[PDB]
Design a protein around this nucleic acid. Structure first.
Ligand SMILES: Nc1ncnc2c1ncn2[C@H]1C[C@H](O)[C@@H](COP(=O)(O)OP(=O)(O)OP(=O)(O)O)O1
Ligand SMILES: [Ca+2]
Ligand SMILES: [Ca+2]
Length: 319
DNA sequence: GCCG
DNA sequence: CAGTAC
DNA sequence: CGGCGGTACTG
């Protein structure tokens, strides 16, 4: 729909970003839920009382909204730390978070060139710094498709029955993507095994995979790769790529989880908890007693159904 | 930051 | 264990 | 006042 409260959310996003890079994770989360609540509200917010009735907006958030309504400006925006642009600069390095960004700032570093010459870097952060510009830009939707087809083609060379899906914002119909996550499975329930490691080998040989961030991550029977790819041809940029191989049993939940968004996932976890359940990339389960009971879910719709929730197409999962 |  | 990412 | 998910890898 249309955001009737753009004059409000524009300013709040600045604060959310400031709180974010300063390590204040929960405070940032509150702003994010608030901003989401505002831009999905059916009309302009016009009073403190009306603001408070909205779930996700309490007194402190309502005070700010009202200030914006009354004067058109937020005072807090004029008192945000001078360090925020620099901490944001450092936080856009893959492998570096707020703790690192603060350490670097406290060491006197103020630019990427300083990090490069005076700072110690993990192998991951060195790759993040090397591809900094390319990772900051979002790719055209059409490029996410080619990357998907590249992984798909290499995978079906081992087993034609394999199924590959690109999740994330791409699956949600965004015109651009921050990165690509390709989910791979097989319907026979077994042929997905033994594919992952020699798939990555193949993709390295043809020069598609350029760097590894996490070469291998084993979570249950899921296998995950985090790395960097680059399509053939002149002018092509380095892009963030994820490859997850999952068994068919967990495909619906994995699909649901990697499609996102992260806000949406969080909301579904909360909803699951109210019905005495848990939701992960692997399954929908009854709450812990020993472990819990895995409720089987062949399709994403079965997940919504077991949660007593009307299905939402991927395009409608922004939060 | 907000909620239960 | 702490930090980071998913 | 505590939860806002739980898990894996890197160092
Ligand atoms: N704290 C979390 N932060 C980010 N992603 C998470 C988190 N928890 C679960 N996920 C999931 C949801 C995401 O859809 C999935 C990977 O998607 P991701 O690349 O991070 O963003 P996105 O593809 O939805 O948007 P975009 O491409 O614009 O960055 O990881
Ligand atoms: Ca409220
Ligand atoms: Ca993505």
């Amino acid at each position: 729909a249309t955001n009737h409260n753009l004059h409000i959310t524009e300013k709040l996003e600045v604060l959310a970003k400031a709180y974010s890079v300063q390590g204040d994770k929960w405070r940032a989360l509150g702003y994010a839920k608030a901003i989401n609540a505002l831009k999905s509200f059916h009309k302009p917010v016009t009073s403190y009382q009306e603001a408070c009735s909205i779930p996700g907006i309490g007194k402190r958030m309502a005070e700010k909204i009202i200030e914006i309504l009354e004067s058109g400006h937020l005072r807090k925006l004029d008192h945000i730390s001078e360090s925020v642009p620099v901490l944001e600069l450092f936080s856009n390095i893959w492998g570096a978070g707020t703790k690192t960004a603060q350490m670097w700032y406290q060491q006197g570093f103020r630019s990427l060139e300083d990090i490069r010459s005076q700072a110690s870097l993990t192998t991951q952060q060195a790759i993040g710094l090397k591809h900094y510009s390319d990772f900051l830009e979002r790719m055209p939707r059409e490029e996410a498709t080619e990357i998907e087809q590249t992984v798909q083609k290499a995978a079906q060379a081992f087993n034609s029955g394999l199924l590959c899906v690109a999740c994330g914002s791409y699956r949600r119909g965004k015109a651009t993507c921050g990165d690509v996550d390709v989910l791979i499975t097989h319907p026979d329930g077994r042929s997905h095994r033994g594919i992952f490691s020699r798939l990555l080998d193949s993709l390295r040989q043809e020069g598609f995979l350029t760097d590894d961030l996490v070469s291998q991550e084993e979570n249950g029977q899921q296998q995950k790769y985090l790395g960097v790819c680059r399509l053939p041809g002149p002018g092509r940029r380095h892009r963030r790529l994820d490859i997850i191989v999952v068994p068919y049993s967990e495909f619906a939940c994995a699909l649901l989880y990697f499609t996102g968004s992260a806000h949406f996932n969080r909301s579904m976890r909360a909803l699951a908890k109210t019905k005495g359940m848990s939701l992960s990339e692997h399954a929908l389960s009854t709450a812990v007693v020993g472990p819990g009971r895995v409720l089987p879910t062949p399709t994403e719709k079965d997940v919504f159904r077991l949660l007593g929730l009307p299905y939402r197409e991927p395009a409608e999962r922004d939060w």
